[PDB]
Design an enzyme around this catalytic site. Structure first.
Site, short mmCIF file in Angstrom:
data_model
loop_
_atom_site.label_atom_id
_atom_site.label_comp_id
_atom_site.label_asym_id
_atom_site.label_seq_id
_atom_site.Cartn_x
_atom_site.Cartn_y
_atom_site.Cartn_z
N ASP A 105 0.82 -1.21 0.00
CA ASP A 105 0.00 0.00 0.00
C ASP A 105 0.85 1.26 0.00
OD1 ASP A 105 -0.82 -2.33 1.27
OD2 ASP A 105 -2.51 -1.37 2.23
N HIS A 150 -1.18 4.45 -0.41
CA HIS A 150 -2.24 5.31 0.12
C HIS A 150 -2.03 6.81 -0.07
CE1 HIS A 150 -5.33 2.85 1.80
NE2 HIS A 150 -4.46 2.08 2.43
N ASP A 177 -4.39 -0.67 -3.08
CA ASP A 177 -4.49 0.48 -2.18
C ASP A 177 -3.49 1.61 -2.46
OD1 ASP A 177 -6.50 -1.09 -1.07
OD2 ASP A 177 -6.00 -0.51 0.97
N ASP A 203 -6.68 6.79 -1.31
CA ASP A 203 -7.36 6.97 -0.01
C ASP A 203 -6.41 7.26 1.15
OD1 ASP A 203 -10.00 6.97 -0.80
OD2 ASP A 203 -10.31 4.83 -0.43
N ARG A 204 -6.94 7.96 2.15
CA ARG A 204 -6.23 8.38 3.36
C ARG A 204 -5.18 9.46 3.11
NH1 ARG A 204 -6.73 2.71 4.82
NH2 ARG A 204 -8.60 2.48 6.12
N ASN A 238 -8.71 -3.25 -1.67
CA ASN A 238 -10.08 -2.96 -1.25
C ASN A 238 -10.38 -1.47 -1.30
OD1 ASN A 238 -8.20 -2.86 0.88
ND2 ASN A 238 -9.89 -2.56 2.32
N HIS A 239 -9.33 -0.65 -1.30
CA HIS A 239 -9.51 0.80 -1.41
C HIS A 239 -9.57 1.31 -2.85
CE1 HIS A 239 -9.63 2.74 2.58
NE2 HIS A 239 -9.09 1.61 2.99
N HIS A 263 -3.68 -8.70 -2.66
CA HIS A 263 -3.73 -7.61 -1.70
C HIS A 263 -4.03 -8.06 -0.28
CE1 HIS A 263 -3.79 -3.50 -0.37
NE2 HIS A 263 -4.93 -3.74 0.25
N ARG A 303 -11.46 -7.13 11.03
CA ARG A 303 -12.01 -5.97 10.34
C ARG A 303 -13.53 -6.07 10.21
NH1 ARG A 303 -7.76 -3.63 6.94
NH2 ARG A 303 -5.87 -4.94 7.12
N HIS A 316 -2.13 -5.01 2.74
CA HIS A 316 -3.38 -4.90 3.50
C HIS A 316 -3.19 -4.50 4.97
CE1 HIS A 316 -7.60 -5.27 4.02
NE2 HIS A 316 -7.65 -6.49 4.50
NI NI Z 1 -6.17 -2.76 2.37
NI NI Z 2 -4.68 -0.44 3.30
NI NI Z 3 -7.53 -0.83 4.49
#
Ligand code: NI
Ligand code: NI
Ligand code: NI
Length: 471
Positions: free
Chosen positions: A216, A218, A245, A248-249, A277-278, A326, A374, A401
């Site tokens: 990731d 991000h 990913d 995001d964030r 997943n993002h 991922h 999660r 992840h």
């Molecule tokens: Ni993830």
């Molecule tokens: Ni992530």
């Molecule tokens: Ni995540």
């Protein structure tokens, strides 16, 4: 027998020192002794939340609520965890309790009511992407005029060149923008490239050649540039696999995604992109990417990115030996590479099934399976990993992840490696990042770690959902 407060105090110490994983283990010890203190459960719930383990947060907070039904922090922590999963309807009920127990809370209830109404509209107009027309049917970048006063990077012809990508990257570094004509050109070309791919991609690394696997990132664009500084720009001789990913964030997601897509357009064999997943609507809607796109580009790009993300491959296999996904593995055994290859991935991730599981699951230290921390997918032990690898004639599973202190962690008797490429995650975790080099034919994992690098004063979640930002 007040050893509960002992562990509880040592746990709060770890939380202050951002050692959430150690904090959790200590709260657990305090709970083993005294399971009738509601604040102990709320504390561990918050700690799970910090690690994005929202499922465990909800369970812990539910127990705090059971211990004292008039303890508002129990409902608060549970509601906050629900919010983080995008589950506004479940969250609303808890914030309604926080209001009832604290009449003099008002802000957050009104915000949650507001968010539920927005959600209701959004769900009403929700239609499967396969049933809609691509925006590529209504948009041709050739007809998009570029003003003479535009001083950014330009794609002169039909070809994305390395000179252009370098110019674009430097402009992004200086917080400049790319014209919508060229943004469309890049994304529309990426769509064509991705839709021609199977759901599981075989990567061939020739004898004497190598490839780098990143976890990731991000939207941490300046750390991305640092990776390229340390390890070289993507190229046919220096290919990269980014394991989901990318957005995001972090608040430079547009800069990252346009950069990664541009390298793909320049040379398809220089970069491989797997879905995380993002890279989905439910996450982008609330975690920053849609907000960043609506701000830096336009509304049409939102639907276009959503469609392109749905064409992203779900997994990669390097030289028949290294399986890269991922999230992780599946709740059922016997799944073959051919099953993943055949997945109709042109959709948002469903709430269950192979596609959901490989994008969302996490490994567990002990054998067997159990509920996900999660609250989505499941967790799988070393036995699950080994059986999958054996069944498919594979040597190693690489995934991402999960945030790691050193940027990586080797689990499941060396058969699983987590790799995470976002150092000082969200400007607070203080973790290192890592990437893994694989050289053929031996394909021995060469793990390299790196530290965070400076970036302009833009906060994480700056473009994200306002309600979620309050937490
Ligand atoms: Ni993830
Ligand atoms: Ni992530
Ligand atoms: Ni995540």
């Amino acid at each position: 027998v007040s050893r509960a407060e002992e562990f509880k105090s040592q746990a709060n110490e770890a939380f202050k020192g951002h050692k959430y994983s150690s904090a959790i283990d200590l709260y657990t010890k305090a709970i083993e002794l005294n399971s009738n203190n509601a604040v102990y459960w709320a504390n561990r719930a918050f700690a799970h939340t910090k690690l994005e383990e929202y499922g465990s947060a909800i369970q812990d907070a539910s127990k705090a609520i059971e211990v004292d039904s008039r303890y508002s922090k129990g409902y608060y922590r549970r509601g906050a965890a629900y919010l983080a999963m995008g589950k506004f309807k479940d969250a609303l009920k808890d914030f309604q309790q926080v209001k009832r127990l604290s009449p003099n809370a008002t802000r957050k209830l009104k915000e949650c009511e507001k968010a539920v109404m927005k959600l209701k509209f959004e769900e009403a107009i929700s239609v499967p992407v396969s049933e809609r027309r691509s925006v590529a049917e209504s948009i041709d970048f050739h007809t998009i005029e570029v003003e003479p006063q535009y001083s950014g990077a330009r794609i002169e012809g039909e070809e994305v060149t390395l000179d252009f990508v370098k110019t674009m990257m430097e402009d992004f570094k200086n917080q400049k923008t790319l014209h919508k004509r060229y943004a469309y050109q890049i994304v529309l070309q990426t769509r064509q490239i991705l839709l021609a791919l199977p759901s599981l991609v075989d990567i061939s690394v020739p004898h004497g050649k190598h490839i780098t696997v990143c976890g990731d990132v991000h939207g941490q664009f300046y750390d991305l540039l640092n990776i390229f500084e340390l390890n070289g720009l993507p190229s046919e001789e220096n290919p990269y696999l980014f394991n989901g990913d990318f957005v995001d964030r972090g608040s430079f997601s547009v800069e990252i995604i346009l950069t990664l897509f541009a390298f793909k357009c320049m040379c398809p064999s220089s970069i491989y992109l797997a879905r995380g997943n993002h890279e989905s609507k439910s996450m982008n809607k609330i975690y920053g990417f849609e907000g960043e796109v609506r701000s830096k580009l336009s509304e049409k790009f939102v639907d276009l990115f959503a469609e392109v993300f749905c064409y992203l491959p779900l997994a990669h296999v390097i030289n028949g030996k290294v399986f890269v996904v991922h999230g992780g593995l599946f709740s059922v055994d016997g799944v073959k590479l051919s099953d993943i290859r055949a997945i109709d991935r042109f959709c948002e991730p469903p709430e269950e099934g192979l596609m959901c599981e490989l994008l969302w699951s996490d490994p567990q230290p002990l054998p067997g399976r159990g509920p996900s921390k999660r609250g989505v997918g499941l967790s799988f032990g070393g036995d699950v990993t080994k059986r999958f690898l054996q069944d498919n004639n594979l040597d190693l599973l690489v995934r991402s992840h999960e945030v790691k202190d050193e940027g990586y962690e080797v689990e499941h008797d060396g058969k699983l490696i987590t790799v995470f490429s976002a150092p000082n995650y969200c400007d607070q975790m203080g973790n290192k990042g890592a990437f893994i080099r694989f050289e053929a034919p031996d394909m021995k994992p060469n793990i390299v770690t790196f530290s965070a690098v400076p970036h302009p004063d833009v906060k994480p979640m700056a473009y994200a959902n306002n309600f979620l930002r309050m937490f």
